[PDB]
Amino acid sequence: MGVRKLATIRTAGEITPIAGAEAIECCHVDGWTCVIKKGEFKQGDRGVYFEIDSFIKEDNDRYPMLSKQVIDYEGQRGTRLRTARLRGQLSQGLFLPMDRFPELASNQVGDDVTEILGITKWEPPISTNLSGEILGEFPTFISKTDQERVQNLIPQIEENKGQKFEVTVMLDGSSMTVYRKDDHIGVCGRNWELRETATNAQWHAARRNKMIEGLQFLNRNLALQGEIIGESIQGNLEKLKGQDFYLFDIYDIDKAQYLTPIERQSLVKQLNDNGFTVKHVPILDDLELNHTAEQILAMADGPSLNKNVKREGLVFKRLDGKFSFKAISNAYLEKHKDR
Ligand SMILES: Nc1ncnc2c1ncn2[C@@H]1O[C@H](COP(=O)(O)OP(=O)(O)OP(=O)(O)O)[C@@H](O)[C@H]1O
Numbered sequence: 027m028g029v030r031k032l033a034t035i036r037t038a039g040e041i042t043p044i045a046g047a048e049a050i051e052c053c054h055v056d057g058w059t060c061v062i063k064k065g066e067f068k069q070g071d072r073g074v075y076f077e078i079d080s081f082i083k084e085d086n087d088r089y090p091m092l093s094k095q096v097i098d099y100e101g102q103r104g105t106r107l108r109t110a111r112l113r114g115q116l117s118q119g120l121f122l123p124m125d126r127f128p129e130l131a132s133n134q135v136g137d138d139v140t141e142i143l144g145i146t147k148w149e150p151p152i153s154t155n156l157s158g159e160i161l162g163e164f165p166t167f168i169s170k171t172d173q174e175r176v177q178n179l180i181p182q183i184e185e186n187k188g189q190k191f192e193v194t195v196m197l198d199g200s201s202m203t204v205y206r207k208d209d210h211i212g213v214c215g216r217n218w219e220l221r222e223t224a225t226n227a228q229w230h231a232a233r234r235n236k237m238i239e240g241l242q243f244l245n246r247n248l249a250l251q252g253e254i255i256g257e258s259i260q261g262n263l264e265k266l267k268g269q270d271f272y273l274f275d276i277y278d279i280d281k282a283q284y285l286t287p288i289e290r291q292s293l294v295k296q297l298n299d300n301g302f303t304v305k306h307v308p309i310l311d312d313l314e315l316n317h318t319a320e321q322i323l324a325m326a327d328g329p330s331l332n333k334n335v336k337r338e339g340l341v342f343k344r345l346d347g348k349f350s351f352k353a354i355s356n357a358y359l360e361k362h363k364d365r
């Protein structure tokens with residue numbers, strides 16, 4: 027969805043020493059924790075925070091601390107920021123003081139500086155198993171699947187205290203959307219509506235679980251959104267044989283809004299009552315929110331759909347369907363260096 031805010035002006039939170047490493051210290055930036063050089067910031071200072079996945083073009087003047095990690099990526103020379111562990115200290119992102127960015131002297135706390143600093147987004151490769159023939163743009167009348175990170179929602183998490191959330195396991199696969207709009211039924215990946223052919227994985231998942239017939243039956247303008255997971259998709263964390271679709275959302279095209287967890291669970295039951303075989307992402311107990319970002323992140327480690335593997339994380343969706351976010355497990359990002 028759109029353009030992610032990879033580089034933004036943010037405020038130095040609590041600064042804590044790293045025992046046994048005098049030259050560095052730990053800086054809290056929103057719900058992120060970042061290793062910084064001793065002295066670069068005091069608590070309350072502003073800086074440009076670059077999130078993990080930032081791709082930072084080689085620059086020995088501005089980004090000398092990245093020199094050793096410069097790779098070749100999409101025909102560009104630069105550095106991919108990723109989760110790391112230093113001295114036993116979890117570190118994610120880069121935080122650089124404002125006087126490194128004279129062109130940002132008149133900007134404000136909160137501003138997105140991704141474009142102006144020419145930062146781009148690194149991402150894992152698409153499973154060429156799932157790059158299909160493109161029929162069309164992702165429909166403008168359906169929301170792309172997107173969840174903000176809990177680390178970026180400190181004030182929101184505060185505000186939602188007392189609110190109840192559906193908790194589901196975050197599956198690591200590829201987003202897929204199967205929808206009906208009047209006389210058209212279509213299957214999309216994360217970014218594009220796809221043509222049906224013999225080798226198209228998403229179309230095949232949709233036929234196999236009878237989800238097009240399912241949409242024909244409900245006779246509503248609805249987009250069924252879920253994760254296609256399994257063999258040859260993002261390394262197959264779940265150790266499935268073959269591939270399959272797990273629903274996580276239903277988007278009401280005529281109303282332009284997501285269905286609430288309750289409405290969504292009812293439709294899935296009716297679908298399955300009528301023989302349409304739609305599986306859902308694993309649903310945990312509802313959570314009454316009363317937590318810091320750090321506590322939410324602790325919860326995110328745990329078993330997956332396959333209980334013998336550690337999950338990518340958890341997705342929280344408010345019972346009214348209008349607020350949601352993801353807590354990616356930091357254990358998972360430490361275990362999986364291509365994440
Ligand atoms: N239980 C779930 N609830 C909602 N989405 C889920 C769930 N399980 C897996 N997903 C997938 O999680 C994705 C959102 O988080 P994810 O980190 O995978 O996004 P991304 O597209 O890699 O974007 P970025 O990493 O740039 O933020 C959705 O696009 C969807 O495909």
Ligand SMILES: [Mn+2]
Nearest residue numbers: 079149150365
């Ligand atoms: Mn991602």
Ligand SMILES: [Mn+2]
Nearest residue numbers: 197198199200
């Ligand atoms: Mn994903």
